[PDB]
Design a protein around this ligand. Structure first.
Ligand SMILES: Cc1cc2nc3c(=O)[nH]c(=O)nc-3n(C[C@H](O)[C@H](O)[C@H](O)COP(=O)(O)OP(=O)(O)OC[C@H]3O[C@@H](n4cnc5c(N)ncnc54)[C@H](O)[C@@H]3O)c2cc1C
Ligand code: SF4
Ligand code: SF4
Ligand code: SF4
Ligand code: SF4
Ligand code: SF4
Ligand code: SF4
Ligand code: SF4
Ligand code: SF4
Ligand code: SF4
Ligand code: SF4
Ligand code: SF4
Ligand code: SF4
Ligand code: SF4
Ligand code: SF4
Ligand code: FES
Lengths: 296, 77, 137, 189, 662, 79, 252, 95
């Protein structure tokens, strides 16, 4: 049973707690142990806080990293934006000496040092790796087939891009996340421009809601045209956009889709037999009941 | 590189269809997996040594799904 | 009163070309190193280096082609093995082995030749006068 | 564009549209290069970045134009552009640039300079306030506490919502860069 | 010994960095120096006259010139030393310009003067110990080899043969012609590419002075400028030419190219000439215009069914049991003309080359548009066989790219061939529109700008924007090309029926292996390197090897042919003379110091050293022709039994001693 | 020489994959046993395949047909 | 003689005819061979680039690329001169390295760095910091007092007009056949191309020989080219001229 | 730019800025060529015209942009532009 510190950023615990609950339960069912991070905070959200000040972005991400450093554990994440912040600041401060120095003399005011000893993983990346739980182990753990459901994957942008800074391979047409959805028994479908941004990154969600919603609506149109019955995602930002933004699209525009948006951990819980009440699917703006009728 | 020698190997139902595309000319070695019997008189005879024999007992009993009785390297055929 | 005496032995086909290119491009560096110019660095015998160090070279530099880029297919592998062994001998006779180094400078690296010149001069200046000159007496 | 008339609407209408060498700020370019950590001066305006941007088809935002402004040193043209905050940082431009430039990193550096000159949307400042107060950009509320309890999780996550002593360290980090002291001042108006 | 020291000013390039007067006075006070003197331009005729007058007056044994680099002016001053009654090799330079002045210009003058005095002292010390050498002259075999049967190889072979030298033309493939045989029409003259080539192929095939050896490779090369012992692998073609059949005893003949064999062969495989678009049997020719019309057998795919031999009948041209024969050929010079291949553009995933059906590259487009190709010359969509009406051309596909996937250089001809293809589609399909997504149209050659003007006039759309990514419509299989029109200032989404990628070119497959066999180095770009990038673009640093064609860097057919004839001329220079002088830097074994240990023998890359019998003692023997003067053996030998002719240990040690003299 | 994979998560230790394998049954149940190596052995309650390098299986399907709650997947394609 | 090789070269097109760039009328407007002589260390200056108007050192230098080229108006040449993009890059590098703090502005319309290592040279020049403004120069005005040159064009990529004031303007003028070249090629019986250069036997497969037997072309006289291409062409012509001399017979 | 929303201010704000091949009017181009009696389809966007225009330094008028619109057939982009009437017909561009 591999053990990881569970970073747990802002949106999953405070808006979609079923995501974190299913994360812990399903990760324990497969051979992974997710340990609470002691006093972790907002990973300085890369858009809304990196746009303001890169130095304080570095300092806060480094503080989050040195918490798990003192814990002597590897970070595990469930958010693409949190992955950007944590993993990328870890990678930058493992190689840039003057930035290490600057962050360290900022952190020395709170009796705290960064040395760069741990690694950062996304939970879906762990589920895909073969040393850690693999696709076959996921298939083994699945107990409810979830058959006869068309499911559209949204990769997001901060997990895989830029490919010159990550290690997940092709960004033009990846299929790895489609294999994790196929392990659950749901057939993943392909839609036009599947690698498009959801529109919520960089603080655009806050600065220009209509612009962000138009970017989201382009995706929703493509997904409905494909014929999806739900949208899996690996990011609480993207889930919030696809969930709230459907309501804001219904009100600001006149478009109705009613497409449930679920984190992959929530689908994994549904596959492994967790209850909808135990997943808190009532906390989503868009009702999941048609999808539950199909897969149950 | 060059694309048009498109080598494909599709399992269309119960027939494993092994194909070589060109613009207008194709080549389809089609194996009917309901009639194969797991003999190797197709692997012994292959002039180009492409056909190999797989899980004969499992496939002939129905306990194997991701394979046929025989595997043909359609790039070598 | 003291100026470092550094001697360089540079091959004709990449290190001499690189030094010439640096000169042509007008890359400045201090005037402390004087060169010998052999054909390949395979020509460099160990006794050349040891003779330099016993006459009183504060430093010795041997510059040649990159591995795989020798004009004579493999003559700098021989030189590299010889200079590794020379580094070992100087350490065990108690002379400071950082007085000697072997750099691989291509024909197009005039800038790198200038940087090598600067770094060799700096290192020898830190090290100081060689001890042989007073140990002889 | 003949000269300054001091009639504001006519100055706006007849603003000199012609680039002069007095318009270049090499200091601005050097600050951008340092902060962005990218080779931005090496752009040759191929248009791949704009061709990949998801914000371009629905707005006047042109990342290639921002790269050109960076190269030419057009400070007060880049920083005051309201389409500096339409980048979602999706990194498609960085993924595809043939010169290995990070235009989105250039955008991030430009946004930092805009904040230092006090141009910044209010959501950013409100997020600064929230993170200062609780350490969380999206904090917990009563209804989510009730939902977590009904799930079975503790009413608060293991974060600084349940360990308020780390909030003081976060606040010192923010105060060292004076982020709060600038955000509140800008919000006051 | 009596040495003269002549210090050049180089026209203030040296006098503006040091004190030439002080250097000259120091040279006068140096030991062994008879005369020291200075001049403004020692490389000029008054400078050589000054050297010669000094030699005659002062009875000089050797000459030291404190001037520019030896790599720049050894031949000049060696010839000046010869003219004057000395050996050319009693001369030594002191580089005080490119290694003293130009690097110690600023704010340091007496330091540069001291460096110059030191360099002059070391040069005088070496020259006081130099002695007479005579360059070795070696005979040159009167044959030549041309590796590559493309336009550059064929032109070089024809040029050498018509100059009268017997020539070998080695081609790995069963036919000569190269890429130009695959081209359909040629920019900017729009001549039928295959048609213009057909005469020259016939000339090569008929020339009595050309030994055309198709379907053959170069296993190994040893030797030097004089004699290259080149071993060739004659791959098992499987079919006999009439000459070989008569030699083996079949009077009725060999292969006449009737085609019955391929009419009956049951194996069907892709044709590499048609870039895989077209079928060909196991026994085959690439196209109907191949020069040796001899019908290779593809033994990797033949099933030995024996139908081909029955079809061939009494001609008996097919030998299904043929094996790789090896031949050793002695040649005087060699010309390398290996050409190029298309860079693998499936690595650029944003342009769905292998993943979308209707995305092709420019050689596949050229085969599709040729009237002899898989189609009847009709461009049709690969996805469904329908005629396109909008065609996009992605220029710079994988080129001028610093991301590490593509090539950082321009491929030279891809702007021109894309213009040609746009013209061809707009004239062959009525109402079809060509869109060129370009980033610097490069029409630089003769009539190229006029060709560009004419294409725009016929109505190709030029969108200045590098393509960002390509999406495939799921149903119509149409391709959505996304970029920005940089001049218009807006993003674009052009939906085309067919997308053509103008991919970069790279050195052919196996070219690095062949150039390592011949001893040629590579460029920064990865192409074969030339002797001097400006004034010698054909010769290489290894003597007797010359470059021709795209193998040295991408070029159009005109530039390729000019380069090929230049290489043929350079390869003919030593063959016509019949003599060639080697540089007397050889190793010479001193036998009554050699102990016969044999340890030096393995230190020679060229195998110039061996153990032999002289006066009962086993000593080492140098093949002075094979030696190249590197000095590895002579730097090894512990007993000092190997002497390097112009860089002897006493000379080098005298230089070291003079450096430490104060 | 195929590859068998046992889903440890639902293996009950029933040992009917060990008893039914005809390569395991070679040692004790053959006259003059040829090879005495074994594919499965139930260690700590789950079936462990000692045949790591996939040399002894013959794709018989006696073990897949034997496990009561299907948990053994047989791969007929090269690993 | 048995054979003849023609290698007459080229001259710079008269760019004073393009009046909008005040070549002869403004002191500080020069062309690229005058710039090359001014920057050479053996030239009239001590290798120091100085302004012709007053002898002061320039700090901003403009390079007008395509000056009289790819021009269909009847004044300039309708063809590309091949090497003018490359030599303008060289001159920009030379000024930026010889005068500390000087800036080079290249007003360009298709940078053409096609040869071996040319694209890398272009990359290196941009890295050293030459400004590339994609716009053909419209006209040039001279400041009456400082003698500085106001260059007016549009930055086509930026999308705005520009007014760059430089101390020295260099015109990358087109090249044309040398003076008397037409007289010499009529003496030898060689025809001319559409472009005005000497014509070759077959434009693809015989770029050296002419239609009149025994006469061969070499160098820029057949069309503009860099020194590498010129030398390859010259050796090709020498080989073609040697073919009949070595045989000693030739069949009419 | 997702689709038409029929809320006029949002349609104005999210107007599709992306050129499609449905936007080209070859009839418009042919009418322009006939009436103007000039070879307008042969522009290669050098910028000399805009660099010489006296209206460009004080407005958004770009004659090169109008030439590009003519070449691409962007009727309803060229005709409705209010900077179509800022040309003084000084003929410097033509010169
Ligand atoms: C799509 C396309 C269109 C083009 N269109 C034009 C055009 O219209 N006009 C124009 O002027 N140019 C055109 N070009 C460029 C033109 O093809 C080249 O200039 C020309 O073919 C160079 O010929 P080459 O002999 O140097 O090389 P190649 O033609 O490639 O010939 C090399 C030959 O050497 C052989 N060979 C390779 N390695 C070995 C080895 N180890 N041993 C033995 N033999 C070997 C190869 O099999 C081949 O026969 C085009 C290029 C492309 C890709
Ligand atoms: S194994 Fe081969 S020979 Fe036997 S039945 Fe199947 S296809 Fe026929
Ligand atoms: S993709 Fe890169 S090179 Fe091209 S315009 Fe954008 S930043 Fe410049
Ligand atoms: S990172 Fe910003 S500029 Fe780049 S493609 Fe995404 S939205 Fe556009
Ligand atoms: S010999 Fe060398 S230093 Fe002397 S004038 Fe000639 S080039 Fe200059
Ligand atoms: S049948 Fe015989 S002679 Fe005819 S083409 Fe074939 S091999 Fe040649
Ligand atoms: S032996 Fe058979 S397979 Fe081979 S070439 Fe002849 S007919 Fe074709
Ligand atoms: S020749 Fe043209 S298309 Fe080819 S790489 Fe160079 S600029 Fe691009
Ligand atoms: S020359 Fe030296 S190394 Fe060679 S055999 Fe003689 S003693 Fe040995
Ligand atoms: S110097 Fe010695 S090792 Fe080098 S080639 Fe000559 S004989 Fe061989
Ligand atoms: S398939 Fe047969 S041989 Fe292989 S492990 Fe199962 S029972 Fe044993
Ligand atoms: S038969 Fe099935 S359940 Fe029993 S031990 Fe084997 S794998 Fe496990
Ligand atoms: S080489 Fe460059 S500057 Fe010269 S005419 Fe051609 S494009 Fe213009
Ligand atoms: S119309 Fe304007 S942009 Fe087009 S070629 Fe003429 S001057 Fe240049
Ligand atoms: S005529 Fe004059 S005002 Fe009109 S576009 Fe031309 S230059 Fe501008
Ligand atoms: S040629 Fe320089 S190390 Fe051998």
């Amino acid at each position: 049973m591999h053990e990881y510190a569970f970073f747990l950023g802002c949106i999953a615990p405070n808006r979609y707690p079923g995501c974190e609950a299913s994360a812990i339960k399903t990760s324990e069912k497969v051979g992974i142990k997710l340990l609470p991070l002691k006093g972790a905070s907002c990973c300085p959200a890369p858009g809304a806080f990196g746009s303001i000040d890169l130095n304080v972005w570095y300092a806060m991400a480094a503080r989050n990293l040195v918490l798990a450093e003192e814990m002597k554990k590897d970070i595990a994440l469930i958010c693409n934006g949190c992955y950007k912040s944590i993993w990328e600041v870890n990678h930058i401060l493992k190689h840039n000496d003057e930035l290490r120095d600057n962050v360290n003399e900022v952190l020395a005011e709170i009796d705290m040092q960064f040395k760069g000893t741990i690694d950062v993983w996304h939970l879906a990346e762990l589920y895909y790796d073969d040393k850690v739980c693999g696709v076959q182990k996921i298939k083994d753990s699945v107990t409810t087939p979830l058959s006869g459901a068309k499911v559209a994957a949204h990769y997001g942008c901060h997990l895989m891009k830029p490919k010159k800074e990550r290690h997940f391979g092709d960004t033009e047409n990846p299929m790895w996340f489609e294999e994790l959805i196929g392990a659950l028994g749901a057939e993943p479908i392909q839609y036009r421009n599947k690698m498009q941004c959801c529109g919520a990154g960089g603080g655009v969600r806050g600065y220009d809601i209509v612009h962000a919603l138009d970017i989201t609506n382009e995706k929703l149109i493509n997904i409905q045209e494909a014929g999806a019955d739900a949208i899996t995602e690996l990011c609480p930002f993207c889930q919030l956009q696809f969930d709230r933004g459907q309501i804001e699209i219904k009100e600001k525009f006149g478009d109705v889709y009613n497409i449930p948006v679920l984190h992959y951990n929530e689908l994994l819980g549904l596959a492994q037999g967790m209850s909808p009440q135990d997943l808190a699917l009532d906390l989503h703006a868009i009702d999941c009941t048609p999808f539950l009728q199909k897969v149950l | 590189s060059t694309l048009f020698p498109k080598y494909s190997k599709t399992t269309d139902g119960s027939k494993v269809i092994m194909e070589q595309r060109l613009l207008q000319q194709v080549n389809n070695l089609i194996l009917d997996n309901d009639i194969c019997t797991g003999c190797g008189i197709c692997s012994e005879v292959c002039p180009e040594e492409a056909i190999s024999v797989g899980a004969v007992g499992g496939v002939r009993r129905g306990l194997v799904d991701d394979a046929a009785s025989i595997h043909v390297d359609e790039t070598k055929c | 009163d003291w100026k470092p005496q550094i001697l360089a032995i540079i091959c004709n086909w990449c290190s001499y070309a690189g030094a010439d290119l640096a000169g042509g491009a007008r890359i400045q560096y201090p005037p402390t190193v004087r060169a010998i110019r052999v054909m390949c660095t395979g020509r460099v015998d160990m006794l050349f280096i040891l003779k330099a160090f016993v006459e009183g070279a504060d430093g010795v530099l041997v510059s040649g082609c990159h591995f795989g880029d020798c004009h004579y297919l493999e003559g700098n592998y021989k030189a590299a093995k010889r200079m590794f062994m020379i580094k070992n001998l100087l350490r065990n006779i108690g002379l400071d082995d950082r007085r000697f180094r072997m750099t691989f400078v291509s024909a197009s690296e005039g800038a790198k030749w200038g940087m090598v010149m600067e770094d060799v001069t700096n290192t020898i200046k830190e090290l100081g006068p060689s001890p042989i000159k007073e140990f002889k007496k | 564009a003949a000269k300054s008339y001091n009639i504001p609407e006519l100055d706006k209408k007849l603003a000199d549209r012609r680039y002069h060498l007095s318009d270049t700020n090499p200091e601005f370019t050097q600050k951008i290069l340092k902060t962005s950590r990218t080779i931005a001066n090496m752009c040759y305006q191929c248009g791949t970045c704009t061709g990949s941007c998801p914000s371009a088809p629905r707005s006047s935002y042109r990342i290639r134009l921002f790269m050109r402004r960076c190269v030419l040193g057009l400070e007060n043209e880049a920083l005051t552009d309201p389409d500096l905050w339409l980048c979602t940082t999706c990194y498609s431009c960085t993924d595809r640039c043939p010169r290995d430039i990070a235009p989105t990193d250039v955008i991030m550096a430009m946004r930092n300079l805009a904040f230092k000159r006090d141009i910044v949307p209010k959501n950013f400042l409100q997020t600064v306030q929230l993170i200062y107060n609780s350490g969380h950009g999206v904090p917990n509320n009563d209804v989510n506490r009730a939902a977590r309890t009904k799930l079975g999780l503790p009413a608060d996550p293991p974060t600084t919502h349940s360990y308020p002593e780390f909030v003081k360290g976060i606040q010192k980090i923010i105060d060292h860069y004076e982020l709060k002291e600038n955000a509140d001042r800008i919000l006051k108006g | 010994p009596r040495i003269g020291v002549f210090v050049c000013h180089c026209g203030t390039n040296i006098a503006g960095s040091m004190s030439i007067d002080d250097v000259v006075n120091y040279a006068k006070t140096l030991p062994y120096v008879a005369v020291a003197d200075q001049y403004q331009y020692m490389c000029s005729t008054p400078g050589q006259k000054k050297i010669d007058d000094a030699i005659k007056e002062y009875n000089l044994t050797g000459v030291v010139v404190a001037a520019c680099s030896p790599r720049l002016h050894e031949p000049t001053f060696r010839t000046a030393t010869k003219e004057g009654g000395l050996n050319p090799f009693r001369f030594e330079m002191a580089n005080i310009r490119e290694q003293n002045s130009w690097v110690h210009m600023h704010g340091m003058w007496d330091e540069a003067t001291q460096k110059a005095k030191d360099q002059v002292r070391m040069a005088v010390a070496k020259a006081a110990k130099l002695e007479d050498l005579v360059p070795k002259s070696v005979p040159v075999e009167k044959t030549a080899m041309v590796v590559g049967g493309g336009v550059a190889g064929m032109q070089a072979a024809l040029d050498l043969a018509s100059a009268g030298i017997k020539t070998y033309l080695i081609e790995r493939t069963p036919t000569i012609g190269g890429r130009m045989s695959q081209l359909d029409k040629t920019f900017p003259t729009l001549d039928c590419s295959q048609c213009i080539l057909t005469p020259k192929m016939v000339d090569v095939g008929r020339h009595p002075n050309i030994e055309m050896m198709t379907y053959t490779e170069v296993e190994k090369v040893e030797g030097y400028i004089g004699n290259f012992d080149v071993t060739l692998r004659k791959k098992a073609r499987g079919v006999l030419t009439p000459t070989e059949a008569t030699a083996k005893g079949i009077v009725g003949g060999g292969c006449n190219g009737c085609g019955d064999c391929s009419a009956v062969c049951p194996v069907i495989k892709p044709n590499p000439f048609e870039m895989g678009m077209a079928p060909r049997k196991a026994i085959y020719i690439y196209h109907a215009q191949v020069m040796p019309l001899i019908y290779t057998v593809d033994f990797d795919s033949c099933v030995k069914c024996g139908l081909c031999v029955e079809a061939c009948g009494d001609k008996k041209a097919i030998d299904l049991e043929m094996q790789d024969e090896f031949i050793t050929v002695k040649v005087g010079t060699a010309v390398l003309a290996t050409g190029y291949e298309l860079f693998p553009i499936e690595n650029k995933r944003e342009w769905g080359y292998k993943q979308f059906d209707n995305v092709i590259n420019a050689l596949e487009f050229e085969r599709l548009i040729c009237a002899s190709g898989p189609t009847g010359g009709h461009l049709v969509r690969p996805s469904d066989g329908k005629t396109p009406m909008k065609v996009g051309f992605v220029l710079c596909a994988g080129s001028r790219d610093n991301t590490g996937i593509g090539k950082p250089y321009c491929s030279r001809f891809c702007c021109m061939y894309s213009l040609k293809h746009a013209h061809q589609i707009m004239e062959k399909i009525p109402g079809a529109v060509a869109y060129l997504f370009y980033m610097d149209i490069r029409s630089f050659g003769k009539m190229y700008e006029e060709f560009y003007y004419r294409i725009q006039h016929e109505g190709a759309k030029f969108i200045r924007g590098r393509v960002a990514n390509v999406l495939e419509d799921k149903e119509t299989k149409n391709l959505h090309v996304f970029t920005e029109d940089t001049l218009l200032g807006r993003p674009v989404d052009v939906e085309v029926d067919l997308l053509v990628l103008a991919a970069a070119v790279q050195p052919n497959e196996g070219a690095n292996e062949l150039r390592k066999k011949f001893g040629v180095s590579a460029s920064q770009d990865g192409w074969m390197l030339e002797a001097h990038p400006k004034l010698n673009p054909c010769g290489t640093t290894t003597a007797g090897v010359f470059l021709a064609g795209v193998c040295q860097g991408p070029k159009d057919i005109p530039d390729t042919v000019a380069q090929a004839e230049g290489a043929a001329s350079a390869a003919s220079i030593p063959i016509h003379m019949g003599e060639v002088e080697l540089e007397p830097y050889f190793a010479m074994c001193i036998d009554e110091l050699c102990a016969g240990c044999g340890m030096c023998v393995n230190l020679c890359p060229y195998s110039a050293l061996s153990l032999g019998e002289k006066n009962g003692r086993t000593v080492m023997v140098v093949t002075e022709a094979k030696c190249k003067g590197c000095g590895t053996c002579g730097g090894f030998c512990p007993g000092g039994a190997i002497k390097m002719q112009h860089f002897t240990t006493p000379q080098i040690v005298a230089q070291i001693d003079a450096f430490f003299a104060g | 020489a195929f590859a068998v994979h046992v889903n440890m998560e639902r293996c009950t230790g029933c040992n009917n994959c060990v008893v039914a394998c005809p390569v395991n049954a070679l040692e004790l149940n053959t006259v003059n046993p040829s090879s005495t190596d074994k594919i499965y052995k139930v260690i700590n309650g789950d079936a462990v395949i000692l045949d790591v390098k996939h040399e002894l299986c013959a794709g018989c399907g006696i073990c897949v047909d034997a496990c009561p709650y299907d948990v053994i997947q047989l791969s007929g394609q090269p690993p």
